[PDB]
């Protein structure tokens, strides 16, 4: 049976940080559900790219559990994720069942909002560091991708490939990650 | 006045190679029109990401001229671009007015189909090389981004940032490209 990923898509999400992990995870044979936070309608991302989700979060959250829950970044997208009761419940359940949670850029600040993974070493976009570190509940890292147990974080659009391949390695192993990596023409 | 970019979006396009240049060009203050080859309806990309274009190509082609015409890759997307009479006319006009043409991955094989920029040094995805080189009308390069006059080409999803920043530099200069680059957290 294939692994399953939930990607939560909110208005203002960084479109690069959404599409790169979805595409790379699907190249890895992961069944990815792109779920719209606000419903089934297409979502307007931070730059003006409009993406139609596979399902509403309301529906997708009923089709769990997922092997990874992925939170894209983008300053306003992450604020929307941080304010959502549905996201809070999903992340708490994932943390409780010891499943992987992956967040990139401003995405990890939603972990702070929902009190997820306190005590973890994490990274974020450099501009999101102060928000993430409010209260000192995490230890900050400048690694391009950071993984502390079941909390996987990354820094920005330019780390999106490394972030996505780290999810693939965590779920499907190093060999699959290497196979997926080669045709991408990475440096 | 701001520069203007036309990005032509066909079914089967590589979504990463579409979104990365659109996002980076908009960060550069370029007015980007994402135009759907087949009409105004949302487009199903190679992995299963659905993107809603800003306009139909039929409408957008009437609002030229553009400072750059951008062709995303993806094997089936590029085949669709190669078969289109509207694309042929747009590229010929752009070539005739000495405007920039930028194509990534399998995208450059549409230049071959429409007899654009013969004699140029070009690169493509490694798997698209044989198709591009059919007849020997170009000289092949393994550079991650290649620019020969007004023909700008690149190799794949992992070269998309370099490709997009090269478009920005060509249109808006090195200083703007450097400013846009820094917050992306590239290596
Ligand atoms: Cu970001
Ligand atoms: Cu490609």
Short mmCIF file of C-alpha atoms and ligand atoms in Angstrom, two decimals:
data_model
loop_
_atom_site.label_atom_id
_atom_site.label_comp_id
_atom_site.label_asym_id
_atom_site.label_seq_id
_atom_site.Cartn_x
_atom_site.Cartn_y
_atom_site.Cartn_z
CA UNK A 1 0.00 0.00 0.00
CA UNK A 2 1.21 3.49 -0.85
CA UNK A 3 1.94 6.19 1.73
CA UNK A 4 -0.51 9.11 1.95
CA UNK A 5 0.14 12.84 2.32
CA UNK A 6 -2.19 15.68 3.29
CA UNK A 7 -1.15 19.13 2.01
CA UNK A 8 -3.21 21.94 3.53
CA UNK A 9 -3.73 24.86 1.14
CA UNK A 10 -4.81 28.28 2.45
CA UNK A 11 -5.23 31.67 0.74
CA UNK A 12 -1.85 33.40 0.67
CA UNK A 13 0.18 30.18 0.61
CA UNK A 14 3.50 30.39 -1.24
CA UNK A 15 2.68 28.62 -4.51
CA UNK A 16 6.23 27.35 -5.07
CA UNK A 17 6.32 25.81 -1.60
CA UNK A 18 3.01 24.11 -2.34
CA UNK A 19 3.59 22.79 -5.87
CA UNK A 20 7.17 21.57 -5.43
CA UNK A 21 6.39 19.20 -2.54
CA UNK A 22 3.15 17.98 -4.17
CA UNK A 23 4.89 17.27 -7.46
CA UNK A 24 7.95 15.59 -5.89
CA UNK A 25 5.81 13.46 -3.55
CA UNK A 26 3.70 12.27 -6.49
CA UNK A 27 6.90 11.42 -8.38
CA UNK A 28 7.69 9.24 -5.34
CA UNK A 29 4.40 7.35 -5.71
CA UNK A 30 2.90 8.97 -2.61
CA UNK A 31 -0.88 9.53 -2.77
CA UNK A 32 -1.14 13.27 -2.17
CA UNK A 33 -4.37 15.06 -1.23
CA UNK A 34 -4.26 18.82 -1.72
CA UNK A 35 -6.96 20.05 0.64
CA UNK A 36 -8.39 23.56 0.67
CA UNK A 37 -8.58 25.10 4.13
CA UNK A 38 -11.63 27.21 3.26
CA UNK A 39 -13.53 24.68 1.14
CA UNK A 40 -13.49 23.13 -2.32
CA UNK A 41 -13.00 26.32 -4.36
CA UNK A 42 -9.71 27.31 -6.07
CA UNK A 43 -7.16 29.08 -3.84
CA UNK A 44 -5.40 32.38 -4.57
CA UNK A 45 -1.73 31.97 -3.62
CA UNK A 46 0.72 34.72 -2.49
CA UNK A 47 1.90 35.62 -5.99
CA UNK A 48 -1.13 35.44 -8.11
CA UNK A 49 -1.25 31.73 -8.95
CA UNK A 50 -4.66 30.08 -8.55
CA UNK A 51 -4.68 26.39 -7.63
CA UNK A 52 -7.73 24.11 -7.46
CA UNK A 53 -7.51 21.72 -4.47
CA UNK A 54 -8.41 18.02 -4.74
CA UNK A 55 -10.87 18.31 -1.87
CA UNK A 56 -11.98 20.55 0.98
CA UNK A 57 -10.10 20.09 4.27
CA UNK A 58 -13.47 19.34 5.85
CA UNK A 59 -13.80 16.27 3.63
CA UNK A 60 -10.12 15.24 3.54
CA UNK A 61 -9.73 15.27 7.32
CA UNK A 62 -12.36 12.52 7.44
CA UNK A 63 -10.27 10.29 5.16
CA UNK A 64 -7.25 9.99 7.45
CA UNK A 65 -4.96 9.02 8.84
CA UNK A 66 -2.10 10.35 6.71
CA UNK A 67 1.56 9.37 6.81
CA UNK A 68 2.57 13.04 6.60
CA UNK A 69 0.76 16.35 7.05
CA UNK A 70 2.44 19.11 5.06
CA UNK A 71 2.17 22.85 5.78
CA UNK A 72 3.35 25.18 2.99
CA UNK A 73 4.65 28.63 3.89
CA UNK A 74 3.89 32.13 2.71
CA UNK A 75 3.36 34.70 5.46
CA UNK A 76 -0.41 35.09 5.03
CA UNK A 77 -1.01 31.43 4.24
CA UNK A 78 0.70 30.46 7.48
CA UNK A 79 -1.38 33.01 9.44
CA UNK A 80 -4.52 31.37 8.06
CA UNK A 81 -3.25 27.92 9.10
CA UNK A 82 -2.42 29.28 12.56
CA UNK A 83 -5.96 30.55 13.09
CA UNK A 84 -7.75 27.35 12.08
CA UNK A 85 -9.39 25.01 14.59
CA UNK A 86 -9.47 22.22 12.01
CA UNK A 87 -5.70 22.47 11.49
CA UNK A 88 -5.16 22.41 15.25
CA UNK A 89 -7.13 19.17 15.55
CA UNK A 90 -5.39 17.53 12.59
CA UNK A 91 -1.90 18.36 13.86
CA UNK A 92 -2.66 17.22 17.42
CA UNK A 93 -3.97 13.91 16.11
CA UNK A 94 -0.93 13.46 13.86
CA UNK A 95 1.40 14.26 16.75
CA UNK A 96 -0.56 11.86 18.98
CA UNK A 97 -0.28 8.97 16.50
CA UNK A 98 3.42 9.66 16.02
CA UNK A 99 3.05 10.63 12.35
CA UNK A 100 5.33 12.96 10.40
CA UNK A 101 4.60 16.69 10.28
CA UNK A 102 6.43 18.76 7.66
CA UNK A 103 6.37 22.56 7.43
CA UNK A 104 8.35 24.99 5.28
CA UNK A 105 9.12 28.75 5.39
CA UNK A 106 6.50 30.52 7.54
CA UNK A 107 4.67 27.20 7.80
CA UNK A 108 6.37 26.18 11.04
CA UNK A 109 4.83 29.18 12.86
CA UNK A 110 1.54 27.30 12.67
CA UNK A 111 3.17 24.59 14.80
CA UNK A 112 3.81 27.27 17.41
CA UNK A 113 0.22 28.52 17.24
CA UNK A 114 -1.12 25.00 17.83
CA UNK A 115 1.54 24.05 20.42
CA UNK A 116 2.98 21.26 18.30
CA UNK A 117 6.38 19.66 18.82
CA UNK A 118 7.64 21.97 21.58
CA UNK A 119 11.32 21.32 22.34
CA UNK A 120 12.14 20.40 18.73
CA UNK A 121 15.03 21.84 16.77
CA UNK A 122 13.43 23.73 13.85
CA UNK A 123 14.24 26.10 11.01
CA UNK A 124 12.08 28.65 9.19
CA UNK A 125 12.43 31.42 6.67
CA UNK A 126 14.96 33.91 8.16
CA UNK A 127 12.20 36.55 8.25
CA UNK A 128 9.92 34.22 10.23
CA UNK A 129 12.47 33.39 12.94
CA UNK A 130 11.34 35.97 15.50
CA UNK A 131 7.73 34.83 15.23
CA UNK A 132 8.67 31.15 15.60
CA UNK A 133 10.95 31.83 18.57
CA UNK A 134 8.39 33.85 20.54
CA UNK A 135 8.54 32.29 24.02
CA UNK A 136 11.58 30.10 23.32
CA UNK A 137 9.58 26.90 22.77
CA UNK A 138 11.88 25.57 20.03
CA UNK A 139 15.60 25.60 19.36
CA UNK A 140 16.46 27.42 16.12
CA UNK A 141 18.58 25.93 13.37
CA UNK A 142 20.04 27.45 10.20
CA UNK A 143 20.18 24.11 8.37
CA UNK A 144 18.39 24.23 5.00
CA UNK A 145 16.28 21.26 6.09
CA UNK A 146 15.97 20.28 9.76
CA UNK A 147 14.48 17.05 11.07
CA UNK A 148 14.01 16.39 14.78
CA UNK A 149 12.16 13.10 15.12
CA UNK A 150 8.72 13.56 13.57
CA UNK A 151 9.03 17.33 13.02
CA UNK A 152 10.54 18.22 9.63
CA UNK A 153 11.10 21.89 8.73
CA UNK A 154 12.73 23.93 5.98
CA UNK A 155 13.51 27.51 5.05
CA UNK A 156 12.00 28.77 1.79
CA UNK A 157 11.27 28.42 -1.92
CA UNK A 158 14.91 27.62 -2.64
CA UNK A 159 14.93 24.81 -0.08
CA UNK A 160 11.66 23.30 -1.36
CA UNK A 161 13.30 20.50 -3.34
CA UNK A 162 15.49 19.47 -0.40
CA UNK A 163 12.41 19.62 1.87
CA UNK A 164 10.31 17.49 -0.49
CA UNK A 165 13.08 14.91 -0.96
CA UNK A 166 13.48 14.68 2.82
CA UNK A 167 9.78 13.82 3.12
CA UNK A 168 10.23 11.17 0.42
CA UNK A 169 13.24 9.68 2.25
CA UNK A 170 11.36 9.64 5.57
CA UNK A 171 8.37 7.85 4.03
CA UNK A 172 9.82 5.69 1.25
CA UNK A 173 13.55 5.44 1.99
CA UNK A 174 16.85 6.79 0.63
CA UNK A 175 16.87 4.71 -2.54
CA UNK A 176 13.49 5.99 -3.76
CA UNK A 177 14.50 9.55 -2.85
CA UNK A 178 17.69 9.16 -4.92
CA UNK A 179 15.74 7.75 -7.88
CA UNK A 180 13.24 10.62 -7.79
CA UNK A 181 16.04 13.16 -7.42
CA UNK A 182 18.07 12.31 -10.54
CA UNK A 183 15.64 13.44 -13.27
CA UNK A 184 15.02 16.78 -11.48
CA UNK A 185 18.43 18.10 -12.63
CA UNK A 186 19.29 19.51 -9.20
CA UNK A 187 22.77 20.90 -8.40
CA UNK B 1 6.35 51.13 -17.36
CA UNK B 2 6.76 47.53 -16.24
CA UNK B 3 7.94 44.71 -18.49
CA UNK B 4 5.35 42.12 -19.57
CA UNK B 5 5.59 38.33 -19.79
CA UNK B 6 3.36 35.79 -21.53
CA UNK B 7 3.47 32.27 -20.06
CA UNK B 8 1.68 29.71 -22.23
CA UNK B 9 0.04 26.94 -20.21
CA UNK B 10 -0.99 23.66 -21.87
CA UNK B 11 -2.38 20.39 -20.47
CA UNK B 12 0.54 18.23 -19.33
CA UNK B 13 2.83 21.17 -18.54
CA UNK B 14 5.31 20.58 -15.71
CA UNK B 15 3.69 22.51 -12.85
CA UNK B 16 6.99 23.32 -11.12
CA UNK B 17 8.41 24.76 -14.34
CA UNK B 18 5.30 26.89 -14.69
CA UNK B 19 4.84 28.19 -11.14
CA UNK B 20 8.50 28.93 -10.35
CA UNK B 21 9.03 31.32 -13.28
CA UNK B 22 5.61 32.99 -12.79
CA UNK B 23 6.25 33.54 -9.08
CA UNK B 24 9.84 34.77 -9.53
CA UNK B 25 8.89 37.11 -12.39
CA UNK B 26 6.10 38.62 -10.28
CA UNK B 27 8.58 39.10 -7.43
CA UNK B 28 10.60 41.09 -9.99
CA UNK B 29 7.65 43.40 -10.68
CA UNK B 30 7.06 41.92 -14.13
CA UNK B 31 3.40 41.86 -15.25
CA UNK B 32 2.86 38.16 -15.98
CA UNK B 33 -0.08 36.79 -17.96
CA UNK B 34 -0.62 33.05 -17.55
CA UNK B 35 -2.53 32.13 -20.70
CA UNK B 36 -4.31 28.84 -21.27
CA UNK B 37 -3.55 27.26 -24.63
CA UNK B 38 -6.96 25.58 -24.86
CA UNK B 39 -9.11 28.37 -23.43
CA UNK B 40 -10.01 29.98 -20.11
CA UNK B 41 -10.63 26.80 -18.10
CA UNK B 42 -8.24 25.43 -15.42
CA UNK B 43 -5.36 23.31 -16.73
CA UNK B 44 -4.38 19.83 -15.53
CA UNK B 45 -0.57 19.73 -15.21
CA UNK B 46 1.74 16.67 -15.54
CA UNK B 47 1.58 15.70 -11.86
CA UNK B 48 -1.94 16.32 -10.85
CA UNK B 49 -1.85 20.03 -10.02
CA UNK B 50 -4.70 22.10 -11.48
CA UNK B 51 -3.94 25.73 -12.27
CA UNK B 52 -6.44 28.39 -13.39
CA UNK B 53 -4.94 30.66 -16.09
CA UNK B 54 -5.40 34.45 -16.04
CA UNK B 55 -6.79 34.41 -19.57
CA UNK B 56 -7.18 32.28 -22.68
CA UNK B 57 -4.28 32.42 -25.15
CA UNK B 58 -6.81 33.56 -27.73
CA UNK B 59 -7.46 36.70 -25.68
CA UNK B 60 -3.92 37.24 -24.37
CA UNK B 61 -2.31 37.09 -27.80
CA UNK B 62 -4.38 40.15 -28.73
CA UNK B 63 -2.88 42.13 -25.84
CA UNK B 64 0.73 42.00 -26.99
CA UNK B 65 3.46 42.63 -27.53
CA UNK B 66 5.26 40.99 -24.61
CA UNK B 67 8.85 41.48 -23.48
CA UNK B 68 9.25 37.72 -23.04
CA UNK B 69 7.27 34.67 -24.13
CA UNK B 70 7.83 31.76 -21.75
CA UNK B 71 7.34 28.07 -22.60
CA UNK B 72 7.23 25.67 -19.63
CA UNK B 73 8.29 22.06 -20.13
CA UNK B 74 6.75 18.72 -19.35
CA UNK B 75 6.82 16.17 -22.17
CA UNK B 76 3.10 16.28 -23.02
CA UNK B 77 2.76 20.01 -22.38
CA UNK B 78 5.55 20.67 -24.86
CA UNK B 79 3.92 18.38 -27.45
CA UNK B 80 0.73 20.44 -27.14
CA UNK B 81 2.71 23.67 -27.63
CA UNK B 82 4.45 22.13 -30.65
CA UNK B 83 1.14 21.32 -32.35
CA UNK B 84 -0.45 24.75 -31.91
CA UNK B 85 -0.85 27.22 -34.77
CA UNK B 86 -1.42 30.06 -32.30
CA UNK B 87 1.90 29.33 -30.57
CA UNK B 88 3.66 29.24 -33.95
CA UNK B 89 2.33 32.70 -34.81
CA UNK B 90 3.19 34.17 -31.41
CA UNK B 91 6.77 32.87 -31.47
CA UNK B 92 7.37 34.01 -35.06
CA UNK B 93 6.15 37.50 -34.18
CA UNK B 94 8.31 37.60 -31.04
CA UNK B 95 11.33 36.45 -33.02
CA UNK B 96 10.55 39.02 -35.72
CA UNK B 97 10.36 41.91 -33.23
CA UNK B 98 13.58 40.76 -31.57
CA UNK B 99 11.90 39.92 -28.25
CA UNK B 100 13.09 37.36 -25.71
CA UNK B 101 11.88 33.76 -25.92
CA UNK B 102 12.47 31.53 -22.89
CA UNK B 103 11.85 27.78 -22.77
CA UNK B 104 12.68 25.16 -20.15
CA UNK B 105 12.95 21.33 -20.08
CA UNK B 106 10.98 19.86 -23.01
CA UNK B 107 9.78 23.38 -23.79
CA UNK B 108 12.57 24.11 -26.26
CA UNK B 109 11.34 21.29 -28.56
CA UNK B 110 8.44 23.59 -29.42
CA UNK B 111 11.02 26.02 -30.83
CA UNK B 112 12.13 23.22 -33.14
CA UNK B 113 8.56 22.44 -34.19
CA UNK B 114 7.95 26.10 -35.11
CA UNK B 115 11.41 26.64 -36.66
CA UNK B 116 12.42 29.27 -34.12
CA UNK B 117 15.98 30.40 -33.46
CA UNK B 118 17.76 27.88 -35.70
CA UNK B 119 21.54 28.04 -35.20
CA UNK B 120 21.24 28.92 -31.50
CA UNK B 121 23.12 27.17 -28.72
CA UNK B 122 20.41 25.57 -26.54
CA UNK B 123 19.94 23.18 -23.65
CA UNK B 124 16.98 20.96 -22.69
CA UNK B 125 16.13 18.22 -20.26
CA UNK B 126 18.66 15.40 -20.89
CA UNK B 127 15.77 13.14 -21.94
CA UNK B 128 14.59 15.69 -24.51
CA UNK B 129 17.97 16.13 -26.20
CA UNK B 130 17.43 13.66 -29.05
CA UNK B 131 14.11 15.27 -29.96
CA UNK B 132 15.58 18.78 -29.91
CA UNK B 133 18.61 17.75 -31.99
CA UNK B 134 16.60 16.04 -34.74
CA UNK B 135 18.08 17.49 -37.94
CA UNK B 136 20.98 19.28 -36.23
CA UNK B 137 19.34 22.73 -36.30
CA UNK B 138 20.76 23.81 -32.92
CA UNK B 139 24.01 23.32 -31.07
CA UNK B 140 23.52 21.47 -27.77
CA UNK B 141 24.79 22.74 -24.44
CA UNK B 142 24.92 21.10 -21.00
CA UNK B 143 24.88 24.44 -19.16
CA UNK B 144 22.08 24.63 -16.56
CA UNK B 145 20.85 27.82 -18.22
CA UNK B 146 21.89 28.75 -21.77
CA UNK B 147 21.34 32.12 -23.42
CA UNK B 148 22.21 32.75 -27.06
CA UNK B 149 21.02 36.24 -27.92
CA UNK B 150 17.22 36.26 -27.61
CA UNK B 151 16.85 32.50 -27.06
CA UNK B 152 17.04 31.49 -23.39
CA UNK B 153 16.79 27.80 -22.43
CA UNK B 154 17.15 25.63 -19.35
CA UNK B 155 17.11 22.00 -18.29
CA UNK B 156 14.46 21.01 -15.74
CA UNK B 157 12.60 21.54 -12.46
CA UNK B 158 15.88 21.88 -10.57
CA UNK B 159 17.10 24.61 -12.92
CA UNK B 160 13.81 26.55 -12.75
CA UNK B 161 15.06 29.16 -10.28
CA UNK B 162 18.21 29.84 -12.31
CA UNK B 163 16.05 30.03 -15.47
CA UNK B 164 13.59 32.47 -13.89
CA UNK B 165 16.35 34.68 -12.48
CA UNK B 166 18.00 34.77 -15.91
CA UNK B 167 14.75 36.09 -17.39
CA UNK B 168 14.63 38.73 -14.64
CA UNK B 169 18.23 39.77 -15.34
CA UNK B 170 17.57 39.99 -19.10
CA UNK B 171 14.50 42.18 -18.59
CA UNK B 172 15.22 44.20 -15.44
CA UNK B 173 18.98 43.94 -14.90
CA UNK B 174 21.45 42.21 -12.56
CA UNK B 175 20.69 44.34 -9.52
CA UNK B 176 16.97 43.54 -9.51
CA UNK B 177 17.75 39.85 -10.11
CA UNK B 178 20.10 39.87 -7.10
CA UNK B 179 17.49 41.59 -4.92
CA UNK B 180 14.81 39.07 -5.88
CA UNK B 181 17.22 36.17 -5.37
CA UNK B 182 18.21 36.82 -1.74
CA UNK B 183 14.89 36.08 0.01
CA UNK B 184 14.47 32.81 -1.94
CA UNK B 185 17.11 31.08 0.23
CA UNK B 186 18.86 29.50 -2.76
CA UNK B 187 22.20 27.65 -2.40
CU1 LIG C 1 8.15 31.22 1.68
CU1 LIG C 2 10.51 19.09 -16.95
#
